[PDB]
């Protein structure tokens, strides 16, 4: 239950209103809201999963590399502060190769 | 749009100017040198870093 023992918690702190990264740049605000995080909403809301108690194994591994796809390895947008990746011309893993192959 | 007509209209000219080309929503196209050193627009520059 500790929030700092929580995997959220510097993806939630990062993902802050209140930081000069969100509040100035909206480019930054989007990528947050398109990983569900609301950086309006106070720190112990951002971290919530909002209407989930339990979760259940279902133990479907073609369900869960299509999974990891979409959200880790090829996103929408890119994953928050990752300017130093998008600068040097990469938004996402998938880009990586689809651009630099050796 | 067909002619474009001249108000002259200074103040009207800053406060378009301002939203336009110096504090946008998103950043200029081709900015991402000066995204990556931490500012998105002209606003940005003296209200990170000032001298």
């Given at each position: 239950?500790?929030?700092?023992?929580?995997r959220l918690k510097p993806?939630?702190?990062?993902?802050?209103?209140?930081?000069?990264?969100?509040?100035?740049?909206?480019?930054?605000?989007?990528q947050?809201?398109?990983?569900?995080?609301?950086?309006?909403?106070?720190?112990?809301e951002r971290m919530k999963?909002?209407?989930?108690?339990?979760?259940?194994?279902?133990?479907?591994?073609d369900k869960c590399v299509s999974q990891v796809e979409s959200i880790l390895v090829a996103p929408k947008l890119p994953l928050p502060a990752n300017i130093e990746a998008a600068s040097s011309g990469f938004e996402s893993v998938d880009q990586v190769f689809r651009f630099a192959s050796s």
């Open positions: 239950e500790d929030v700092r023992k929580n993806l939630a702190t990062y993902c802050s209103v209140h930081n000069p990264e969100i509040s100035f740049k909206v480019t930054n605000e989007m947050c809201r398109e990983n569900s995080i609301d950086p309006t909403k106070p720190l112990a999963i909002e209407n989930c108690s339990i979760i259940e194994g279902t133990g479907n591994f």
